[PDB]
Design a protein around this ligand. Sequence first.
Ligand code: HEC
Length: 303
Amino acid sequence: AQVATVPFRLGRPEELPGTLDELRAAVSARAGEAVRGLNRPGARTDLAALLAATERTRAALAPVGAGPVGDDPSESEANRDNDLAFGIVRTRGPVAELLVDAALAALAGILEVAVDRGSDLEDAAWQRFIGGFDALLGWLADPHSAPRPATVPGAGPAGPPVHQDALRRWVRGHHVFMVLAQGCALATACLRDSAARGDLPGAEASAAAAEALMRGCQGALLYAGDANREQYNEQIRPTLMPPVAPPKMSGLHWRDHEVLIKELAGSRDAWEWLSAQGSERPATFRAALAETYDSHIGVCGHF
Ligand code: HEC
């Protein structure tokens, strides 16, 4: 709809790999490709070369999309209308590798607006918001080491508010939601599995990935509210037409979010287990966890 790239191809979060070995054999080859693309020389000089690097990468990548899913018996209309509302199409194929394409696609969508018209988001919140991609792809490239944070160029100050540019950031922002939700769902399932199997190094890396993905979602919720408050201001005009409403998420029941909170639940005993074995991630995660829950205010309706 010229506000976001549609359809946004995405995997079924239920089919996501569940253990650190199944994740690596499935996604580490395509993720490491994407990591090499987003850190090739010159790509981090400014925000412009980062967008060009994002496009060269996903262009070079052999697309894995085996078409739309279609007849899905596990999908409800509460999931479908929620998927339609933001142009999401569930796509057949390597679900983990699709998450790599969705990440590269959603990031490029965020980078277009910030190159033409900058961003009034704080330079500290801007970092964790983009670093969530570096976290996801860096960890997907090597699910057994904590991802090391790379440099993220700044954004210019917010230029002239173009018509419904806060709507472009509202739809393009919700794609980052489902991208980062699936990723954080992985690192929790791997943390749960590694903990039960006595994989202490694997538990540490998965927790580190989940935390940087949680901090990356907090910055995604600030970016969302920045565009929703700017939306609330854009509607003081009395409109003789029926006032077209911004697409909203219909309650907690969007698919990737349903999976992530189920993963987060029942992962309780693993976080306490990491804290006992001398880890420092259990503390800084609960920080990012509460920071993210607070950041729903101003973004989610039923909230
Ligand atoms: C509106 C729909 C949203 C959107 C845009 C996001 N979340 Fe979620 N979330 C939502 C609700 C209604 C609730 C329950 C609130 C309550 O019961 O008081 C939640 C809860 C969470 C949680 C807590 C999980 C738990 O307590 O076990 C987390 C961690 C969470 N939500 C994460 C999250 C992230 C990372 C989002 C951006 C991708 C996000 N939410 C968006 C509803 C909504």
